[PDB]
A = this chain, B = another copy of it.
């Protein structure tokens, strides 16, 4: 499932992802109702660097299960194909 894949690639995700991808993924997750306004604002406002934002986003998304990680994987593949190829997914 997608949760194991996302757990296996955590360091690469932290070291590779940028701010525009963070914003787009947050918008997609809010649209799909995986996250609510409070969680999104906690991710955005409580962290200053993009590494901390990625860390918080991954730690928020993984416990939700495989159906929540599949949305992230599909969005990244469809919108960040170069980053998706670098990440091996």
* A contact residues, total (Cβ < 8 Å): 43
Cβ–Cβ contact B20 & A42, under 8 A: yes
**In the complex, which residues of chain B have a beta carbon less than 8 angstroms from the beta carbon of A30?**
10
If A41-B50, A45-B48 touch, whether A85 touches B67 (CB-CB below 8 Å) is yes
Cβ–Cβ contact A10 & B31, under 8 A: yes
Cβ–Cβ contact A64 & B39, under 8 A: no
Name A14's contact: one of B15, B27, B51, B83 (CB within 8 Å): B27
If A16-B63, A83-B63 touch, whether A28 touches B42 (CB-CB below 8 Å) is no
Interface centre among A28, A64, A68 (most CB of B within 10 A): A64
A14 CB to closest chain B CB (Å) equals: 6
